[PDB]
Amino acid sequence: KMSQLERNIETIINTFHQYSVKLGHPDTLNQGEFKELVRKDLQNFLKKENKNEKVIEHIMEDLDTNADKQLSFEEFIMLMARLTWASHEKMHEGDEGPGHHHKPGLGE
C-alpha cells in the first residue's frame, strides 16, 4: 500500500529509531548514537567525514538547532535532506547537457 516515497521516509525513521532508543531519551540521538548511525549507515555518503571524528562532532553541533546536545528527528532530517541534495549534485557534477542524465551519486 505504501508508496516508494513513504517507504523511503520509513527507512529514515526506522534508522533514526534503531539508534535513538539505545541511551538516554529514546526519541533523540545523543552524540554516541549519532556517531554510530553515521559510521554504519552513512559509511559511504560520509566516507571522508567519518575519517575525522571532529568533523562528525561539528556536523552534529550544526544540526543541533535547540542546543541540547541531542538530535530530535526534526533536527536530524535536515542532514537527510542535505545528503540527498549532495548526492543529486554529484550525479550532475560537470554536466554538459543537453537534456538530463545522472552519473553515480555520493559514495560511488
Binding site: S3, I9, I13, G107
Partner: protein, 89 residues
C-alpha cells in the same frame, strides 16, 4: 553496495524524477505533475492540504515549477509528519 539508508535517499531522488522527467524542464515538476505526485506518493493526511496549496507553498520563486530543492521541502515535511504519526496515539 550502498546501505539501506543511502539507497533510501537515492530513491527519493528517483521519486522526484518520475514526475520531473514527464515534460518540459528535467528539474521542473509542474502543477499537474505535483498533483499526480501527491496522489501517488503521499498519504491522505498530506494530500488533504490540497495540491494547489502545496504547489503555492513549494514554488518559492514563483516560476511555475517545483525544482529538486523545492521538492525537498515536501520531503522534510512528510518526514516530520510521519515520524510524529509513528508515536500516535
Amino acid at each position: 553496495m550502498l546501505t539501506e539508508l543511502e539507497k533510501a535517499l537515492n530513491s527519493i531522488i528517483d521519486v522526484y524524477h518520475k514526475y520531473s522527467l514527464i515534460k518540459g524542464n528535467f528539474h521542473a515538476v509542474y502543477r499537474d505533475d505535483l498533483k499526480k505526485l501527491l496522489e501517488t506518493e503521499s498519504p491522505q493526511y498530506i494530500r488533504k492540504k490540497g495540491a494547489d496549496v502545496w504547489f503555492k507553498e513549494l514554488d518559492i520563486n514563483t516560476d511555475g515549477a517545483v525544482n529538486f530543492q523545492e521538492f525537498l521541502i515536501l520531503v522534510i515535511k512528510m518526514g516530520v509528519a510521519a515520524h510524529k504519526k509513528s508515536h500516535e496515539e
